[PDB]
Amino acid sequence: MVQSSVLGFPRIGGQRELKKITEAYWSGKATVEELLAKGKELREHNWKLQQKAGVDIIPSNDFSYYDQVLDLSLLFNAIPERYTKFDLAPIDVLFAMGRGLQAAATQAAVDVTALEMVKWFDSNYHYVRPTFSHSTEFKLNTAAGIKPVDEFNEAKALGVQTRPVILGPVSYLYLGKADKDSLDLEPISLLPKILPVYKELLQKLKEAGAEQVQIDEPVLVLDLPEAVQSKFKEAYDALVGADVPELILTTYFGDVRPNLKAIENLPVAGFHFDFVRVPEQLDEVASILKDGQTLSAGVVDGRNIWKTDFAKASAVVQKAIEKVGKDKVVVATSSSLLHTPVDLESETKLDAVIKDWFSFATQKLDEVVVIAKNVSGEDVSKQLEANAASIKARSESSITNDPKVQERLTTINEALATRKAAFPERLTEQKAKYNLPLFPTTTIGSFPQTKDIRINRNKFAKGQITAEEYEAFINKEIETVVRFQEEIGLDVLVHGEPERNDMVQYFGEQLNGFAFTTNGWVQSYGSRYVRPPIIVGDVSRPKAMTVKESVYAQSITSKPMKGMLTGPVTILRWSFPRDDVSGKIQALQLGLALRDEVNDLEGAGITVIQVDEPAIREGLPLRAGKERSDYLNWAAQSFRVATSGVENSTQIHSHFCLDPNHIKALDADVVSIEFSKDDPNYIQEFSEYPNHIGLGLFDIHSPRIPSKQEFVSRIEEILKVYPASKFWVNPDCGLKTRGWPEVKESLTNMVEAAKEFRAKY
Template sequence: MTKTIIGFPRIGEHRELKFATEHYWKHQIDQSELLANAHDIKVAHWQAQKDAGIDLIPVGDFSFFDNLLDTAVALNVVSKRYRDLNVSELDEYFAQARGYQADGETVRALPMKKWFNTNYHYIVPEFTNETDVKLIGHKLFDEIKEAQNAGVDPKAVIVGPYTLLKLSRFLDGTKPAKFVQPLIAAYQELLAKLNQAGVEYLQIDEPALSFDVDGNEKAIFDQLYDAILANDHGVKVILQSYFGDIRDVYEDVTNKPFYGIGLDFLEGAHNLELINEKGFPADKHLFAGVVNGKNIWRNEYDHTLNLLAKIKTDAPIVLSTSCSLLHVPYSAANEDGLASDVKQHLAFAIEKLGELVDLDHIVNHDDAGADLLAKNEALFKNVKHPVNSTVHNRINALTDADYTRLPERSEREKVQKDEFKLPTLPTTTIGSFPQTADVRANRRKFRHHEITRDQYDEFNREKIARIIKIQEDLGLDVLVHGEYERNDMVEYFGEKLDGFVFTQNGWVQSYGTRGVKPPIIWGDISRTAPITVDASVYANNLTDKWVKGMLTGPVTIFNWSFPREDIARKETVTQISLALRDEVLDLEKNDIKIIQIDEPALRENLPLRKSDWYKEYLDWAVPAFRLVHSGVQESTQIHTHMCYSEFGDILKAIDNLDADVISFEASRADFTLIDELVDDHFQTEVGPGVYDIHSPRIPSEAEIQDLIQQIISKLPVDKIWINPDCGLKTRSEQESFDSLKNMVEATKVVRGSIYEHS
């Protein structure tokens, strides 16, 4: 059988792309050096796939920041404010992703949102009346030449026009239909040029087909592809879907002259029913996504063989991954620190290439296949996940009362206003402050046993004392301790809880050059000792102002970890919730009266189809959050934070978390969420982020004043908090302090005008 993958991790085996790109941003290398580094990374990745035995190697899946942004740029979907910068093509590209500030010129970045149900973030393109769609980009063609020169026969990859339209913003009253004909012409030209370049295959990614598709959207899809495929351009076009099934357009897709159709048979299990009920054309190739591209466990070959056997079609089947391998680390071979009984069950990107080849051998019934199948069967008979009976007993004893906080939020709000006596529009931050070089060095020394625990803790206490004083001087109303002891908001908690194991090099791209190293859930989860209490209490004793305790929520810890596949998600999340509940109650006992339980990933695993939202996710995710905080006193204020997802359509569920204050990412999306809060009669107090921390740009005081005025014109002033849109961990201290100073001063001006008119 032919073997392929949808995409490969692009940051490099040891994050080489991250470091090269950041060096370029800091002017430590020039553009030619960055491009040379990128070339070496791409060639190494293509060679790894070739050596593994992959037949169709994707080219075009590489990106300096984001593939959807790459597609938009290639199609001339670039807003005028970036063109007017008159900088290099590469710097114009980065300005869209990160914002721009130089020589008195300042431009905001494009919005950034979560890529479907993953922790990867994409850049949201903007279509306006000035957008002139046409094929201008050369990146894909440059990479095709690079691949061909490296001896690789490329399968070109690009995001499809339907997904581009579905995920973009439309300003100036424009509608997607306006751009259909120009997109048709651009993709027709793309096919013609690929043919001229000697490319045999083009994979067009259309993951947006896994959303609900209404009649108007289906009409756009049909119009696009009926025209794009109307002429034979000599290129074999593969329509690739992932993250779900394509039930709303299955017949539309299978009736079009695609060479191949890629279907996800893991998250899109309904695709199997579609094939068996409606048939699959024998004259097309079925690209079967049967190796999990989003989790890191070894493929159980018996299960996959059974799945393949259930697919009723005479069409040739191509073995593939369920989605791009962008969402898993590079190679488990680099994990020398893991116990062998754990490591043997892991498959990162490189290992998944081998699994596709193994499956081919097994399906072909050759001698190697029989041996591979026997070894795999033996592996899965020897899984030893740790079991904690106390945890199971606690879960079995839970009742509805454990998920309900009393009194109701409206009554708590009155008590808390009297308790905290905060000014109108209280100011705070989301939690973390910059992880400066000395902070990282201190952590590294401790891990390498170069300093003692006391020395490590003393350094962090000095950093906490310093940041408390800085926040007081800035004039913030509610302070945080800075989180200097934390490497990552999920990994840190995982390290303190039983049931997790950790990688050394298991980096996964989150956005741009930002990588995360998700913990692996291996056994039952429990808390054996307080996690955040010491740092929170220390900070609280340094100031007369209120200090927030900071926790990562249970759903985010789960969603940003690699979970087990042998037990229900609800079971694991409930275990995490009980562990965090103990932590919250300990914080409260130690006089921490404001506690923030962050859930930035609440929406992340939400099924793509609305009909599945509650029965498959929200019905257990929302109660899991409530279980964490339901035991606190009415005067203890519970905050949460969410960012970079489309939250508007689940606002009722978010309100039902029963937090007292929720902060959102809002500024990068032009505060569109505010209108949705109003329309939904949202009851929780809110802190819409008034500036974008993912950009190095420092917002002016006047700009923030204007944003605050927009907020108070729409929301009750007594329900508004003022804060950045996310934690400050990735920014420099100077950027952070200057931005916060402007935020506080802007708030004081607006607050003064409110008092004058009251």
């Protein structure tokens, strides 16, 4: 009987219960008792769901109040000393590490900054960086409760035997970093210090009744130095024994084969591999399995929302079985379901035809169960036919296939992805048209939204005000924002984006080929969740998406007004993508759609246009090689397809917040980049690059208003390495999140600073 397995379950709650209780706890509205009770209710509900679905191997320890990686840091005492000085209980040290701590002045006021949040591989999840010192003393924090033991026992008392999930020692160290007081520390060097702590944990788990543990080593999908590769043998020889559970060494998101020698002689009880991302590694990883080791075949996607093709997924599982035996194969999710929304049944608005194409986390439980039944030999012909019916329906739908878009993709060529002239030529035309001063000043697009704008957006959404009346409210807010920038002397203006509530959905809703959810929430970081759009079909742009507000904003000033678009790569990366066509094709369709928009802005007199690509690094393939170099190429091509239809005197800006070669490949006239927190070398990499650059002069995610003189010095430092003729002056990013008084004196200072450089030059 081939078993089914789930690597982890989203913990947020089908009604975002976990957000609501954690935020109430942080705001003082809930007690720690109420927090802990809600966490227990969620874990019970999710274990029972899984048990009811028939899943054999059910996870525990996959729950968290903030981040599972930080949970391990608390558990092993990797807690920087600065957090321990406030008589905080362990849960509150946890939350301090994750989200910072502010305490009144007595001493000057406390503001302890959170530990760094880091992207978890190429997922859209973020973890809290494990942070280590020379003095770090790893040990089990017994008084804090031992989370994996306690949750295991909690499950067992409900009659649900689980498999605890922990991040393994190699990955945990390797993904961490040295704290500021220990900059010469290599985290992996600490392996002999942490191994005993994992061994004690594992002993305690075995003593509690856990017979198997899922031990995640996802760094096996990265390019690993040889000296790191040898550490798996060291680590797992130490851990495996009679006194601990069986270990299933678990990998996801990529290809382990370059590291196969590292895991070919381990004493573990089995492995898990991701055959959704890399089905082609099956043969080779199957080939190294020892006698009795088992193979967990990850065939239900943990990172996207499409209904699994049961035939194709069973076929992958069957190839494994043919190599190693029915007795030694498990059917699994490819990764944790952390990366999927909770339940498709919550959607109130999607048409049944489209819903039929989808499976969210709750549905994926049934999938792994049915697939394991099918390969075990049970008659699930009904479920298979029903599944094959669904698959076939999507394949043929006109929603998926738009022949006009297909025809347009064939038109893509070098000319479509190249400006009419190179930058030096273009610059001559732009100097004639705009005559911008040296050290031109600008901002990134968004400004603080009033309370009245947010109330009116709600009222418009109910028809309580007419479209005409909402437009008037938005234009009034644009006027205010333009008037402000004029009075303080900014040279290239923006409209403040009051009409936009999200950088991707604002465009998706106006594009064909997209579907949206009502409750499709995924954890991004802590209690901050995203509800990604879904790309369902071929993408096109029926009409103007942004032109009206930008033309209004340009109409009330003689200063150049930036139009403002999210780039194709970001819209793709922050959506659930199609799994039937490449990311490349999706990005090029998005590039063509955005080209119509750039073209329409230019035509309407908006001849300065910025394209925001915050998510460019985020799709970077995980290993060096052809995939990675292809991605950088198509990512740049898709941006160039969006932007290369314009006249030479039209000024294209790109905002990033990356490899300088890639930046240069976009051939933007002006770039802005987050830069206020680095190497003076990267700056010199664009010494001889003619196109212009604005390095962010202050942190928009903080609010400590820099003086005029503070700006002058930050600029003098860049000028030592960078010519004055190319330098633009701007903030790090948009100002949507900041308050007006901070915005106003900071901006006023920034301009006053630039003008001093204009006098000197």
